């Protein structure tokens, strides 16, 4: 089929036990991704794609979270976490106001062509750096809803 699914979480940096960045796997089922701790400032987590494809649309929803960036990437080699290329920058979704009780605690977005790089975009990758950004937290955890892919 046209769409690109996930597979396991190759890398992370900030993932909790029971709400991993792994739950990220299950996009339907009952759970999403949460940083190891509280005062969400800045969350990172790669995830793999269970196939090397090129990417044309992204799908990811926000828990709580206001910029998410998405670099791309493959298994080859496996050296560092820079060898990847921006596919496409944080995006803006929320603030760190509504997040709380102000206005929209909760909403999903999506990405398409425009919003990825085509030099690299439409090269077969089949590792994604996912890095949401913005302080809304404190003492509970949070991040993103789901992650999904789709060329």
Known sequence: MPEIRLRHVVSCSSQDSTHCAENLLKADTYRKWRAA???????????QLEKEEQIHSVDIGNDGSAFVEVLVGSSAGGAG???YEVLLVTSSFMSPSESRSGSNPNRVRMFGPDKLVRAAAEKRWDRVKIVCSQPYSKDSPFGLSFVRFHS
Do not use: R
């Open 37 to 47: 701790k509280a005062g969400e400032k800045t969350i990172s987590v790669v995830l």
């Open 81 to 83: 976490e820079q060898d």
